[PDB]
């Protein structure tokens, strides 16, 4: 751990991380539907659909072990409510023991097979009923048909949206969290091995979200690397933080040039998880770690640049650290995973690197900088050369690289590039089981000639092709010569603009990829 | 002298190639009335047809090879046309039964080749040299060139052939034969062309050098090395001496840089008696970020702003030629106020009032107009030397792209005789330059309410003329001229510098 | 001939006053030798001090004891000669009559430029606009040649006159005291003719586009030719279609006003030994077409002056028609139209054919000035002239090259360029020679048409446009004056009438 430099004594010297969230205190109990439901204290919610009939009537098909509540939930009373996706209603009644209970439902539409987006819409309605109410238990009854991955996704998303980050509130606050969660589902014994898997995947996403949402005066190269050391110490992971003196010896000129104009020294994070049984799989995960992207002398001054959001330019690093928690907790075997990130800050200063400067990567390649705001591929280039030297089988990088993703895939799907069938297909398969959507995009070799520099070995940016995401992959491909490599561009999907919060995108996708090899 | 670094990987010197492959070519001129000999790689005939639109190229020189003479017969060559730039390659056996290659370049139908057309002819010639591994090239001038145009042919041949590879990491011909009429009168142009070539290429090397390599300290380090490799008196002025000369305008521009200001002062003096004292001043901004007036506009071209020291490179490139040819009855001072215009907590602000070394207070209206601030203090320094002519050359205003464009430089001045000395030098050096006026009506728009003078105007959008009006206030009695090369310095199509200004200044000193 | 209207309240003619109050001013020039008489009105001394911001010193004998005491060196030293500074006082003369005496500072330079002269007049006109005088007397204590003396009169008359045609007490005598008075006398009535030619063109330019349209401008051109007795013929759409003027007719395709080609002719009484064709760009309103002037800085609100070249040409027709030069034939041409946005407008990318058969690829509809001039230049060349001179507000790049003071001249014959420069010296309308750089010609090579209308790489629009017009003059000495930056006086919010006096001096010599 290094000392965080400060301009004034009021500058923060560490990122606040919440490890023991109220989600961790929720006792989760799952029961089988073929045994009846017991309407207890708190709120009991039914997940109901109606296949074929758009906005069809509500019909409860589960045995309720209460004569009074069964009379309330009869077909001749559900009738006036429909199953439109996202609709919710509250019921108040008295049970057989003359006790007042609260019951309700959330409509799951028709369609029968709900997408990840549709399930989020259902979960958001569920959270609205959990909000502004002081319940001690919530019970969810699954009268919709879901597989194991979608059931785990339901719990992960519910935990994540229910959780509220108040680390930076002072004068502001309000009300409490439920202490128990009940789940009724057919074949319940098969679904509940996913419960504690969902709790692990939740915190990894929330931990990544905590690091992303942390501003750049809190989350800087020094404090971000310190948090990775702190996380590795709790999970007993091997760790090494590379300082400038070691990065100078490794000749990481591309990575070092980006951080020249920062008051925080560059810090390269290298975490390692090793298995007990002999290792038959070696994987290196690389994340872009720019704690703040001012753009450099190519300053983000255009209206659409969204510079006030550029604290999220380390979303790739947070996704890898979130994976380090999930992998470090569940402990898969026969794998070595290397969690890497070249962390720095891209600022404007007398010491900053200039547009037009020619820099040398750690593999000997010289690069002519055409735009200082394209610093991601420069830091990733040195990180990929470092990653390949570790002798791994797969290299997967994740980065908020290009704003062009907002104009290609948008805010819902991330893009994956690569040089190999199966690493892309294994990543695409992991997107299916993790329910984090990713789309395969091409590396068009015709654009490679536009990176031909007149003086340096290669140009950092193209001079003609406006497809920045594809050109960046072509540039990064030049720094992986022999290893299977894939690249995930999450620049469009990392931040939830409507909810004004991070998504923690990549944690579950990367973890599922490690666990399925 | 020591280059500061942020990290240990920051370079501390500009890589400079002094012995280029062009210097290894033995250039050899023969008279065309005597026959051409064929026996090597590539032989090229320069052919025209004055009158016929794209008429047939006609071989007129006697070739001392029976078989190659039969190939070049009029009933044979007929097919090919003379269109300016066209080229074809031939293979055949000579009188010694050895395999040879011959070709031609079309030179159009204009008996006097234009000074831009000869560039197109040279570029066509270079294409045959690039994808080829030839050992010797022979050029037969079957077209009219005067002595100045012939030197230009070699200079353009030398410069375009040469390849800049100082920043690459992860063959050239050895003999050049020229068959030309009255070869004895052109012979003296061979070594003058090679000297002009390297001066231009040495300037291109400084311009193409990026800003992390080419900084105020490393650029002045190259100047003392060049002054030492030649034999000019040299002194580099550091911040401490510039403060005592009270050059506040120049010091304010470099305030926000991590590199200290360095003022270059080279001097060549003649052995005999001196009848002319000349000061050549070059704007030396190693990198122009624009300051707090940051170049963020779309057409700002921030990635090319390493070229804002091209005027300094033009002065140093001319210093090599002068230091080599050693003209007489002349004293030349090579001046440049070298610094870097950065954004920092130490940078100077829009609205700041600064004082030049001649006492005039300047209200800064735009930090991107930093070149005239460094030039102003350099002009006061130049006039203090007691010279007869002061010529400054600068990539001053981007408005040159919309006035004269990328081909013609603009010249301003307060003395029309000096302008014709520059315009005459532009003609013989073959670097085109057009005379533009200093319109005195715009001078009132530089009237500052609080300082002595405004740095920029607010009403007049003719920045090239307004900037010249600003510099004119800092030359009190000496004849002065100003060359604005902001539009012609960089060759955008070739993605490399032109080295513009080296030969124009050398021809100005030599005549 | 009949102006079309959208509504019955749309104007159908441009208003012109031919009889201005300036024409009623009796001008008398006296020699400073023998003393000055200060009886009535306002008397102003034009004084310099060759130092900087030096004191005022009157050196002329005043034939009034009371006014002489006011002009004593001790009393006048409290005022300075800063260029533009002025003070005027009211006092009693020897006859106890109310008189006004003052000065206008002319700096510390002996030879005044045309811009310095403009500044001196502006101070004089401001004093005339705030006083109710019957006579103005100017005492010349500075050196001016006969051209600058005439330029002083033209500029004084032009700035003094106020255009009130769109709105809803001038002096009656002008006295001038100057050493060597007998040589300057002949310039008085030439300045009055030069003044109105400039003021006439200003009236056409300042007239808004709803008043000045292709029909009403050509109608006004016919009226001027009838008042002067010049030949006139106006080409309609049917005749322009027979001449195959595809470039000129394409620009006006989207306008509600039909195209009108102005062709005026002056011819001498003696034998003709020189024939000259003057072409003026006459775009009554330039919206830019589908390349609309919408970007910041395009100044779409001022675009009624895109016919300034035509107004300069028609103003030259008045000056020539009045002074009646000899042994010369002058043709005043203008391809008048309007560049608007409509379903009938021509589009970017359209390929059009000029009257000489060349196909043109339109790359920008706002570069319509070179399209109308191209067909106008072909028309002029068929007339068999010695010189073709066109004047146009062609390129906005002129504001960034030469600015608002100097016009740019281009040409294919540097003997004719020399003649126009010389007229710039005598007319005192400043013009600077700019090059036609042939290296840029290749960038006008179209992939599909014979030639491109605009370049896509060279940002030197003033030179590229001159290269385009050069392709339509095969035979004749031709020159081109770009007055886009100098035509409108932004400080005074009014036109300058630029080109009228320059072209007239070119014709007379
Ligand atoms: Zn960036
Ligand atoms: Zn970034
Ligand atoms: Zn600048
Ligand atoms: Zn500059
Ligand atoms: Zn236009
Ligand atoms: Zn126009």
């Amino acid at each position: 751990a290094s000392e965080v430099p400060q301009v004034v004594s009021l500058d923060p010297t560490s990122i606040p991380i919440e490890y023991n969230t109220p989600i961790h205190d929720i006792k989760v109990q799952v029961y089988d539907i073929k045994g009846g439901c017991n309407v207890e204290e708190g709120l009991t919610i039914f997940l109901v659909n109606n296949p074929g009939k758009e906005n069809g009537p509500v019909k409860i098909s589960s045995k309720v072990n209460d004569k009074q509540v069964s009379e309330f939930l009869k077909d001749e009373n559900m009738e006036k409510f429909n199953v439109k996706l996202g609709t919710s209603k509250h019921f108040y009644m008295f049970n057989d023991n003359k006790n007042s209970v609260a019951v309700g439902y959330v409509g799951c539409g028709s369609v029968a097979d709900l997408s990840e987006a549709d399930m989020k819409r259902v979960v958001l309605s569920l959270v609205t009923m959990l909000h502004d109410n002081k319940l001690s238990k919530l019970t969810v009854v699954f009268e919709i048909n879901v597989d194991k991955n979608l059931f785990r996704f339901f719990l992960e998303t519910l935990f994540y949206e229910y959780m509220t980050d108040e680390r930076f509130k002072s004068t502001d606050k309000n009300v409490e969290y439920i202490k128990h969660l009940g789940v009724y589902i057919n074949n319940a014994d098969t679904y509940k091995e996913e419960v504690e898997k969902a709790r692990v995947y939740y915190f990894g996403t929330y931990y990544a979200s905590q690091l992303i949402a942390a501003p750049s005066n809190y989350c800087n190269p020094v404090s971000l690397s310190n948090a990775a050391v702190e996380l590795a110490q709790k999970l007993n992971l091997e760790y090494k933080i590379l300082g400038v003196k070691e990065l100078e010896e490794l000749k990481m000129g591309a990575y070092l040039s980006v951080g020249k104009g920062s008051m925080y020294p560059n810090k390269f994070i290298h975490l390692t998880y090793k298995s007990k049984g002999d290792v038959k799989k070696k994987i290196a995960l690389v994340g872009k770690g720019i704690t703040f992207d001012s753009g450099g002398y190519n300053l983000k001054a255009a209206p659409g640049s969204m510079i006030d959001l550029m604290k999220f330019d380390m979303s790739g690093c947070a996704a890898v650290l979130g994976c380090a928690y999930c992998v470090g907790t569940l402990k898969p075997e026969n794998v070595e995973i290397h969690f890497l990130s070249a962390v720095c800050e891209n600022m404007v200063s007398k010491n900053s690197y200039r547009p037009g400067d020619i820099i040398t990567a750690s593999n000997g390649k010289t690069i002519e900088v055409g735009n200082t705001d394209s610093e991601g591929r420069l830091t990733l280039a040195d990180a990929l050369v470092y990653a390949e030297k570790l002798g791994v089988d797969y290299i997967v990088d994740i980065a908020t690289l290009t704003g062009a993703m907002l104009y290609s895939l948008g805010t819902s799907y991330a893009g994956v590039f690569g040089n190999n069938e199966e690493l892309i297909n294994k990543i695409l398969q992991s997107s299916k089981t993790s329910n984090e959507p990713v789309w395969w995009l091409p590396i068009i070799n015709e654009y490679r000639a536009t990176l031909n520099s007149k003086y340096a070995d290669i140009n950092q940016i193209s001079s003609s092709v406006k497809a920045s995401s594809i050109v960046a992959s072509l540039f990064l491909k030049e720094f992986v010569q022999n290893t299977a490599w894939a690249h995930i561009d999450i620049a469009g999907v990392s931040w939830n603009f409507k909810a004004r919060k991070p998504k923690g995108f990549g944690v579950r996708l990367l973890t599922e990829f490690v666990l399925n090899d």
Side-chain angles (χ1 to χ4, degrees), chain A residues 1-33 35-39 41-52 55-58 60-62 64-66 68-75 77-79 81-97 99-112 114-120 122-171 177-178 180-192 194-239 241-244 246-250 252-273 275 277 279 281-330 332-431 433-480 482-497 499-517:
Chain A
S2 310
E3 303 321 312
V4 179
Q6 329 168 257
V7 194
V8 298
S9 77
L10 311 179
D11 278 315
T13 62
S14 87
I15 307 159
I17 282 78
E18 191 148 2
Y19 296 97
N20 297 108
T21 75
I23 303 308
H24 288 94
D25 298 317
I26 311 190
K27 279 151 169 174
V28 177
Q29 213 93 28
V30 49
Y31 321 98
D32 185 278
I33 271 180
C37 298
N38 301 336
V39 200
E41 66 269 30
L43 187 50
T44 311
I45 298 309
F46 295 87
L47 300 188
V48 278
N49 65 343
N50 200 337
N55 302 5
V58 174
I60 302 289
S61 77
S62 293
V64 172
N65 302 338
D66 191 89
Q68 295 290 94
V69 170
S70 277
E71 183 71 6
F72 192 104
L73 287 181
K74 63 151 82 193
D75 273 357
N77 282 330
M78 280 326 122
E79 142 186 319
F81 310 118
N82 75 83
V83 296
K84 186 189 179 190
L85 190 64
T87 184
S88 56
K89 282 295 199 183
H90 281 100
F91 308 144
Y92 178 90
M93 72 211 75
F94 296 83
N95 73 343
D96 287 333
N97 291 254
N99 285 322
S100 93
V101 304
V103 193
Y105 81 94
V106 167
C108 308
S110 328
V111 186
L114 274 165
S115 63
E116 40 95 33
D118 287 346
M119 186 64 84
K120 181 150 190 253
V122 156
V123 163
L124 288 181
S125 277
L126 195 40
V127 173
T128 64
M129 325 167 77
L130 283 185
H131 275 353
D132 294 306
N133 196 341
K134 257 159 187 180
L135 308 150
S136 54
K137 184 200 303 186
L138 160 78
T139 323
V140 174
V141 188
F142 276 82
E143 305 202 357
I144 68 175
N145 190 14
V146 294
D147 77 61
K148 288 168 163 114
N149 298 325
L150 193 67
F151 178 72
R152 190 193 58 241
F153 178 78
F154 166 77
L155 290 168
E156 300 158 343
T157 325
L158 162 76
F159 291 162
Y160 182 88
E161 293 302 325
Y162 193 38
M163 194 41 222
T164 303
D165 180 356
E166 296 206 306
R167 291 175 298 134
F168 304 93
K169 303 272 183 183
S170 171
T171 75
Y177 290 79
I178 58 164
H180 302 278
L181 179 65
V183 154
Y184 287 77
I185 187 173
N186 291 283
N187 311 120
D189 270 348
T190 51
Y191 287 95
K192 63 160 186 204
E194 311 276 328
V195 161
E196 271 320 310
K197 200 181 174 260
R199 214 194 280 271
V200 166
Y201 279 18
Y202 141 76
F203 179 67
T205 310
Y206 186 56
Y207 175 72
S209 158
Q210 275 187 87
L211 295 178
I212 294 154
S216 300
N217 59 337
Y218 286 81
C219 172
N220 45 72
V222 193
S223 75
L224 184 50
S225 39
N226 288 337
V229 174
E230 195 173 297
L231 171 81
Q233 284 165 347
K234 293 172 184 292
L235 289 158
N236 250 30
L237 297 166
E238 273 144 25
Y239 72 83
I241 304 298
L242 305 189
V244 185
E246 165 136 44
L247 307 170
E248 281 170 354
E249 268 286 339
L250 301 174
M252 287 169 171
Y255 172 39
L256 280 187
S257 275
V258 177
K260 275 169 63 181
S262 180
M263 65 166 285
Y264 311 97
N266 290 53
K267 301 282 177 167
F268 186 115
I269 290 170
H270 181 174
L271 271 42
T272 311
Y273 165 82
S275 285
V279 162
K281 268 310 146 57
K282 274 182 199 83
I283 292 194
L285 286 181
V286 175
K288 181 187 170 188
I290 312 303
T291 73
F292 182 73
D293 198 346
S294 93
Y297 271 95
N298 285 102
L299 177 74
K300 285 172 197 279
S305 352
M306 298 163 12
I307 188 177
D308 74 335
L309 201 92
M310 276 307 143
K311 82 193 172 189
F312 95 118
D313 219 26
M314 34 84 52
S315 282
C317 179
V320 189
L321 290 185
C323 186
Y325 166 73
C326 298
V327 177
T329 294
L330 293 150
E333 31 199 87
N334 314 124
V335 311
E336 291 215 353
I337 326 295
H338 297 274
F339 309 88
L340 325 175
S341 177
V343 184
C344 52
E345 202 187 41
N346 196 31
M347 306 285 282
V348 197
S349 160
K350 70 181 27 180
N351 302 311
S352 284
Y353 78 135
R354 283 151 298 265
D357 286 356
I358 284 172
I359 64 194
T360 300
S362 53
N363 64 343
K365 279 171 162 105
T366 79
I367 313 154
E368 171 148 69
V369 164
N371 190 302
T372 58
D373 198 13
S374 288
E375 86 295 324
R377 50 195 109 173
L378 298 181
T379 73
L380 286 166
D382 271 320
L384 297 172
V385 169
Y386 181 91
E388 186 159 39
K389 274 158 136 13
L390 304 166
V392 306
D393 308 330
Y394 305 140
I395 316 171
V396 180
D397 78 74
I398 177 153
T400 45
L401 212 30
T402 48
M405 306 294 311
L406 287 174
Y407 298 112
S408 34
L409 298 182
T411 40
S412 182
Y413 283 46
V416 52
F417 307 73
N419 56 3
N420 175 27
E421 308 266 19
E422 46 154 40
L423 178 51
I424 298 160
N425 273 325
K426 279 175 172 184
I427 282 195
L428 284 169
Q429 159 75 3
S430 297
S431 182
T433 57
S434 83
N435 305 270
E436 283 185 304
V438 186
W439 199 263
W440 177 19
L441 286 177
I443 303 189
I444 285 132
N445 294 329
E446 170 158 24
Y447 303 155
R448 158 97 199 80
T450 84
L451 286 186
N452 285 332
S453 180
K454 180 64 160 186
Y455 294 106
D457 289 328
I458 192 180
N459 266 338
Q460 161 207 39
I461 72 186
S462 165
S463 34
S464 34
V465 158
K466 272 174 227 155
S468 327
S469 304
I470 301 180
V471 181
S473 323
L474 270 161
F475 174 93
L476 293 168
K477 187 154 142 259
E478 285 289 321
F479 300 82
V480 185
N482 312 281
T483 314
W485 156 81
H487 160 56
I488 306 187
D489 199 336
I490 43 149
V493 300
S494 164
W495 191 259
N496 190 331
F497 291 98
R500 339 185 74 211
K501 61 144 86 192
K503 288 186 207 179
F505 193 110
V507 176
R508 286 172 286 167
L509 166 65
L510 293 180
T511 312
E512 283 279 287
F513 164 61
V514 162
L515 256 54
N516 276 342
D517 225 298

